């Protein structure tokens, strides 16, 4: 090639820099002989990088210690960011070696993963160390194929993990990817997709672009972008590979998304245009750790076409800066500090420092060769190498074992994969208030040495979402489902995109975004929101509640009246005037009425086994013995008509036999109940589904049937015998009184039937207990009030 930066010396290096951005887009129709294509657009950043390399080389040549007597020369070429020019230059590099089947010993060539691979395939064939400064693809680590490649820029797996970490930190799960179609974008987005699907993050679309894409492919890509709902768009590409898509996006006014820039185009001047920043607001990109090169800007300001004989690119540089010709003609007096261009309009050195570091590392390897001591070398017999006759593979061997200190005082040392690691800065795009150009204000940091999970660190106070608002935009497929509801599948959409369905009654969902409703335990139940389990609010006939205290009051006043009549009897015990009747029978009847009044107590509280298991036979025996005694408190016609009949001769104790017979019969059934089917004191849910009710299911139905039959037949026979003799003046015609009492007993039975048979849980027990209480109360009152009245009022009883 003609245009190049050439300088002689004892040792020659090679450089490859993208001075231009691309080649002249034209189709070689092949109707005539094809010739060398000329590049089109200028790139001042590449010229700054070239100046950095030249500065490093000359500064090394000025230092007296590093390489004391030797001198470093160079043959730097231009690649125009394509492969053809790079391979032309590379063939111009290995010419002396090519004649095997000006020998350069090292090449610093970079800025394209594709270009870097294309060069390293050829340089590694002659074992020429190539130290790239910007090639960051993960494919260049396959040291089984790129034998002689080392890069002073970190790899690009950490960057994919960092983008995944950023997406996870802002709590997003619905994104979309876009990648240039070269060796830089594809592996990057593959690694990112892997790490994303690991972290449970869904990806909507995935398109590829390139600077040679025709309007139809870009149209399709813009349609895919527009016809989607994800707001986060991760981009892995370089400036020139993204310019057309961005042109289309800004011409179509797509102004909603959030761009996650990769390292290549995060700081590119092709994309950071004030026109573009309208529709591409809120970008968050990565950047390398800045560096310091003392006196570099002063060297930059010295460039001049006439005073540059080694450098040959200063001519076109001046022609491009001042826009002149060597239409208007140039003069060698212009002021480079006047015009504005990415040449001097920088604040931090990020890639230029990489070039400086690469040149200094190669120089340090050379110096290490210079200061070898025999017997301690790295070659066959621990031998050293002749620096005056140094070869490329020796420099490579020494570079693999290089370990020195940088200018900032950091330990530069290449990993066994030939690459040094480094932290990341995280940049947000801002609009400058005074000028109006884009400005990269650093808002985050990414440490690579720290353990997993604790690497990313962002400072959200500075981030400007769309420049207007101040809150993280929402970019999930579907809004979360608050507690009370649960997730639900959509048939085709990915897992990160669902709908919400309500928990059916009886189940609850406390946490948000739950996969399935939970059924409260039987003790508990759904709330009104189906959010919280509330207790089943169990219920039964309580004690302190008005009904319970009132029934207990009635019972105890019954006991009080009974004890009252007992006291009256005891005070006048020795008076058979009214006690001409069997005083023992009065004893028994009064105590039996006490027991009957007490029996009610067994139907109050919560039903355990004890409670009902004894509450049925309690009333049973009590009322049957009461009715038997009041039956015997009558005429003995059948007894007079009838061992047993021998005992029916004299002695009142025979009457007792009667009761001590019939109750015996009764207790038989009861003891049957004891060991045949005791009433199950158990709970019930089926009746209410909301509140448990505790009852007792009598296991022996026919047994209680027989019991009730026995007591009612006793009642029938006693009532009939009473009525048949209801009009006999036997001491105030007591027969009419006993008819009255047993009649009201029958009324109690009848009017009790409908009550319990047509009421809810607690009130059934309440009505049963009030029925038994009223029955026994009425019977006792009717039997004893006449006698107590006549005794307390008129003690004239003779016949």
Ligand X SMILES: *[C@@H]1O[C@H](CO)[C@@H](O)[C@H](O)[C@H]1NC(C)=O
Ligand Y SMILES: *[C@@H]1O[C@H](CO)[C@@H](O[C@@H]2O[C@H](CO)[C@@H](O)[C@H](O)[C@H]2NC(C)=O)[C@H](O)[C@H]1NC(C)=O
Ligand Z SMILES: CC(C)(Cc1ccc2ccccc2c1)NC[C@@H](O)COc1cccc(Cl)c1C#N
Q: Which residues bind ligand Z (CB under 6 A)?
A: 704-705, 708, 748-749, 752, 756, 768, 771-772, 775
Span from 93-101, 152-160, 446-454, 580-588 in contact with ligand Y (CB under 6 A)? 446-454
Residue 268 is a binding residue for ligand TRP (CB under 6 A): yes
Minimal distance, residue 704 CB to ligand Z, in Å: 5
DSSP 377: S
351 interface partner picked from a copy of itself, ligand X, Cl ion, none, CB below 5 to 8 A per type:
Cl ion
User: Cα separation of 194 and 157, whole Å?
Assistant: 11
- DSSP per residue, 339-353: S--TTT--S-BSSHH
Query: Do the Cβ atoms of 632 and 659 come closer than 8 Å?
Result: yes
Q: Which of 189, 272, 351, 630 binds Cl ion (CB under 5 A)?
A: 351
DSSP 72: E
DSSP 184: T
708 interface partner picked from Cl ion, Ca ion, ligand Z, none, CB below 5 to 8 A per type:
ligand Z
Residues between 145 and 184 with contacts to ligand Y, criterion CB under 6 A: 171, 173
Residue 18 is a binding residue for Ca ion (CB under 5 A): yes
397 interface partner picked from a copy of itself, ligand Z, ligand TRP, none, CB below 5 to 8 A per type:
a copy of itself
Residue 354 is a binding residue for ligand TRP (CB under 6 A): no
Strand-pairing partners, residue 682, are 695
515 interface partner picked from Cl ion, ligand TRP, ligand X, none, CB below 5 to 8 A per type:
none
- DSSP per residue, 32-64: S------B--B-HHHHHHHHHHHHHHHHHHH-S
Instruction: Extract the tokens encoding 180.
Output: 């240039």
Q: What angle do CA 322, 323, 327 make, to 5 degrees?
A: 135
- Of 74, 86, 92, whose CA–CA distance to 17 is shortest? 86
Closer to ligand TRP at the Cβ: 129 or 239?
A: 239
Closer to a copy of itself at the Cβ: 32 or 544?
A: 32
Residue 697's φ and ψ, nearest 5 degrees, are: -90, 115
Q: Name 282's Cβ contacts closer than 8 Å, sequence gap at least 6.
A: 258, 259, 428, 429, 463, 464, 465, 466, 467, 473
Q: What angle do CA 631, 632, 637 make, to 5 degrees?
A: 100
Minimal distance, residue 273 CB to ligand X, in Å: 15
Strand-pairing partners, residue 107, are 14, 130
Minimal distance, residue 753 CB to a copy of itself, in Å: 5
Q: What angle do CA 776, 780, 781 make, to 5 degrees?
A: 115
338 interface partner picked from ligand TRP, Cl ion, ligand X, none, CB below 5 to 8 A per type:
ligand X
Tokens 């036997």 belong to 730
Closer to ligand X at the Cβ: 338 or 347?
A: 338
Span from 345-353, 442-450, 661-669, 713-721 in contact with ligand Y (CB under 6 A)? 442-450
What mask, x for binding a copy of itself by CB under 8 A, covers residues 79 to 98?
----xx--xx--xx-----x
350 interface partner picked from a copy of itself, Cl ion, ligand X, none, CB below 5 to 8 A per type:
Cl ion
Q: Which of 489, 580, 661, 674 binds a copy of itself (CB under 8 A)?
A: 489
CA distance from start to end of the chain = 158
- What is the per-residue burial (b if ≥16 Cβ within 10 Å, else e) of 111-129? bbbbbbbbbbebbbebbbb
Closer to ligand TRP at the Cβ: 153 or 175?
A: 153
User: Cα separation of 720 and 740, whole Å?
Assistant: 12
Query: Do the Cβ atoms of 414 and 399 come closer than 8 Å?
Result: yes
Closer to ligand X at the Cβ: 337 or 544?
A: 337
User: Cα separation of 482 and 494, whole Å?
Assistant: 20
Minimal distance, residue 447 CB to ligand Y, in Å: 3
Closer to ligand Z at the Cβ: 14 or 617?
A: 617
492 interface partner picked from Ca ion, ligand X, ligand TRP, none, CB below 5 to 8 A per type:
Ca ion
Closer to a copy of itself at the Cβ: 186 or 348?
A: 186
- What is the per-residue burial (b if ≥16 Cβ within 10 Å, else e) of 365-393? bbbbbbebeeeebbeeeeebbebeebbbb
Neighbours of 630 (CB within 10 A): 22
Minimal distance, residue 217 CB to a copy of itself, in Å: 12
Residue 136 is a binding residue for ligand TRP (CB under 6 A): yes
Residue 200 is a binding residue for a copy of itself (CB under 8 A): yes
Closer to Ca ion at the Cβ: 90 or 111?
A: 111
Q: Is 422 helix (H, G, I), strand (E, B) or coil?
A: coil
- Of 507, 510, 511, whose CA–CA distance to 526 is shortest? 507
Find the residue with minimal CB distance to Cl ion.
350
Instruction: Extract the tokens encoding 192.
Output: 């990112």
Tokens 């690579």 belong to 448
User: Cα separation of 81 and 16, whole Å?
Assistant: 9
Residue 537 is a binding residue for ligand Y (CB under 6 A): no
Instruction: Report the interface residues with ligand X, using CB under 6 A.
Output: 253, 255, 335, 337-338, 403, 411, 413
Query: Do the Cβ atoms of 131 and 155 come closer than 8 Å?
Result: no
Residue 796 CA, chain-centre distance (Å), reads 95
Closer to ligand X at the Cβ: 335 or 644?
A: 335
- If binding means CB under 8 A, how many residues of this protein chain bind a copy of itself? 62
Residue 659 is a binding residue for Cl ion (CB under 5 A): no
278 interface partner picked from a copy of itself, ligand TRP, ligand Y, none, CB below 5 to 8 A per type:
none
Neighbours of 142 (CB within 10 A): 11
What mask, x for binding ligand Y by CB under 6 A, covers residues 575 to 614?
----------------------------------------
Residue 134 is a binding residue for ligand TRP (CB under 6 A): yes
501 interface partner picked from Cl ion, ligand Z, a copy of itself, none, CB below 5 to 8 A per type:
a copy of itself
Query: Do the Cβ atoms of 741 and 629 come closer than 8 Å?
Result: no
Radius of gyration for the chain, computed over Cα atoms and rounded to the nearest angstrom: 54
What mask, x for binding a copy of itself by CB under 8 A, covers residues 26 to 65?
--x-xxxxx-------------------------------
Max Cα separation, the chain? 163
CA distances from 56 to 49, 51, 355, 363, 617 (A): 11, 9, 8, 10, 112
Closer to a copy of itself at the Cβ: 132 or 666?
A: 132
Minimal distance, residue 89 CB to ligand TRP, in Å: 18
- DSSP per residue, 204-270: EEEEEE-TT--HHHHHHHHHHHHT----EEEEE--HHHHHHHHHHHHHHT----EEE--HHHHS-TT
Residue 350 is a binding residue for Cl ion (CB under 5 A): yes
Residue 406 is a binding residue for ligand Y (CB under 6 A): no
Residue 445 is a binding residue for ligand Y (CB under 6 A): yes
User: Cα separation of 209 and 238, whole Å?
Assistant: 11
Residue 4 is a binding residue for a copy of itself (CB under 8 A): no
Q: Which of 107, 108, 115, 266 binds Ca ion (CB under 5 A)?
A: 115
Closer to Ca ion at the Cβ: 243 or 419?
A: 243
- If binding means CB under 6 A, how many residues of this protein chain bind ligand Y? 12
Q: What angle do CA 520, 524, 525 make, to 5 degrees?
A: 65
Residues that bind Ca ion (CB under 5 A): 18, 79, 110-112, 115, 239, 268, 492
Residues that bind ligand Y (CB under 6 A): 171, 173, 200, 422-423, 445, 447, 449-450, 474, 476, 480
Residues that bind ligand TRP (CB under 6 A): 111-113, 134-137, 184, 238-239, 263-264, 268, 351
Residues that bind a copy of itself (CB under 8 A): 28, 30-34, 83-84, 87-88, 91-92, 98, 101, 114, 118, 121-122, 124-125, 127, 142, 144-145, 147, 181, 186-187, 190, 194, 200, 206, 210, 212, 378-380, 391, 393-394, 396-397, 400, 487-495, 498, 501, 504, 515-516, 750, 753-754, 757-758
């Amino acid at each position: 090639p003609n245009q190049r930066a050439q300088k002689k010396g004892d040792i020659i290096l090679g450089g490859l820099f993208p001075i231009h951005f691309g080649v002249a887009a034209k189709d070689q129709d092949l109707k005539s002989r094809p010739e060398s294509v000329e590049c089109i657009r200028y790139n001042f950043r590449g010229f700054r990088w070239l100046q950095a390399m030249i500065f490093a080389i000359e500064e090394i040549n000025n230092s007296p210690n590093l390489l004391p007597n030797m001198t470093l020369g160079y043959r730097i070429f231009d690649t125009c960011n394509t492969v053809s020019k790079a391979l032309e230059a590379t063939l111009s590099f290995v010419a002396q070696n090519k004649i095997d089947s000006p020998s350069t010993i090292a090449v610093v060539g970079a800025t394209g993963s594709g270009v870097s691979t294309a060069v390293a395939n050829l340089l590694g064939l002659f074992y020429i160390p190539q130290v790239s400064y910007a090639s960051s693809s993960r494919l260049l680590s396959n040291k089984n194929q790129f034998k002689s490649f080392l890069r002073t820029i970190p790899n690009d797996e950490h960057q994919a993990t960092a983008m995944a970490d950023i997406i996870e930190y802002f709590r997003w799960n619905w994104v979309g990817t876009i990648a240039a179609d070269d060796d830089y974008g594809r592996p990057g987005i593959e690694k990112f997709r892997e790490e994303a699907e690991e972290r449970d993050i869904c990806i909507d679309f995935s398109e590829l672009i390139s600077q040679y894409s025709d309007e139809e492919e870009i149209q399709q890509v813009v349609e895919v972008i527009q016809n989607s709902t994800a707001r986060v768009i991760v981009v892995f590409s370089s400036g020139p590979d993204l310019e057309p898509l961005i042109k289309e996006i800004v011409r179509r006014n797509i102004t909603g998304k959030i761009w996650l820039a990769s390292e290549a185009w995060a700081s590119s001047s092709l994309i950071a245009m004030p026109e573009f920043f309208r529709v591409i607001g809120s970008t968050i990109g990565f950047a390398l750790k800045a560096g310091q090169i003392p006196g570099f800007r002063e060297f930059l300001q010295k460039v001049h076409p006439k005073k540059s004989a080694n450098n040959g690119f200063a001519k076109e540089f001046w022609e491009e800066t001042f826009n002149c010709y060597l239409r208007p003609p140039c003069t060698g007096d212009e002021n480079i500090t006047s015009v504005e261009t990415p040449y001097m309009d920088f604040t931090h050195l990020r890639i230029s420092y990489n070039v400086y570091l690469a040149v200094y590392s190669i120089a340090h390897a050379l110096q290490d060769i210079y200061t070898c001591t025999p017997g301690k070398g790295l070659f066959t017999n621990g031998s050293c190498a002749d620096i005056k006759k140094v070869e490329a593979w020796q420099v490579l061997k020494h570079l693999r074992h290089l370990n020195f200190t940088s200018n900032m005082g950091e330990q530069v040392d290449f990993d066994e994969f030939g690459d040094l690691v480094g932290n990341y800065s995280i940049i947000n795009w801002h609009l400058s208030p005074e000028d109006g150009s884009v400005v990269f204000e650093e808002v985050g940091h990414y440490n690579v040495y720290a353990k997993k999970g604790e690497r990313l660190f962002i400072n959200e106070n500075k981030i400007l979402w769309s420049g207007f608002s101040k809150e993280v935009p929402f970019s999930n497929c579907s809004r979360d489902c608050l507690p009370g509801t649960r997730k639900g599948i959509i048939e085709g959409e990915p897992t990160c995109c669902f709908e919400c369905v309500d928990c059916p009654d009886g189940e609850y969902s406390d946490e948000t975004d739950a996969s399935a409703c939970d059924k409260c335990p039987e003790d508990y139940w759904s709330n009104e929101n189906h959010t919280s389990c509330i207790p089943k609010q169990i219920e039964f006939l309580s004690w302190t509640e008005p009904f319970g205290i009132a029934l207990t009051l009635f019972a105890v006043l019954g006991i009080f009246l009974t004890s009252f009549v007992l006291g009256v009897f005891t005070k006048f015990r020795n008076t058979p005037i009214v006690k001409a009747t069997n005083r023992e029978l009065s004893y028994l009847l009064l105590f039996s009425l006490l027991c009957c009044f007490s029996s009610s107590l067994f139907f109050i509280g919560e039903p355990q086994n004890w409670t009902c298991r004894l509450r049925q036979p309690a009333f049973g025996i009590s009322f049957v013995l009461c009715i038997s005694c009041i039956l015997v408190k009558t005429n003995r016609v059948l007894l007079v008509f009838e061992t047993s009949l021998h005992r029916k001769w004299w002695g009142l104790n025979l009457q007792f036999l009667l009761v001590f017979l019939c109750t015996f019969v009764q207790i038989v059934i009861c003891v049957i109940w004891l060991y045949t089917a005791p009433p199950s004191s158990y709970r019930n849910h089926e009746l209410e589904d909301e509140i448990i009710f505790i009852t007792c299911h009598e296991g022996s139905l026919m047994a209680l049937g027989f019991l009730i039959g026995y007591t009612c037949l006793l009642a029938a026979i006693c009532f009939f015998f009473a009525f048949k003799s209801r009009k006999l003046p036997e001491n105030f015609n007591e027969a009419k009184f006993i008819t009255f009492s047993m009649l009201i007993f029958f009324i109690v039975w009848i009017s009790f039937i409908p009550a319990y048979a047509s009421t809810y849980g607690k009130f059934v027990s309440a009505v049963e207990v009030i029925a038994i209480l009223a029955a026994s109360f009425g019977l006792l009152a009717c039997i004893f009030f006449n006698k107590v009245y006549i005794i307390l009022f008129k003690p004239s009883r003779n016949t």
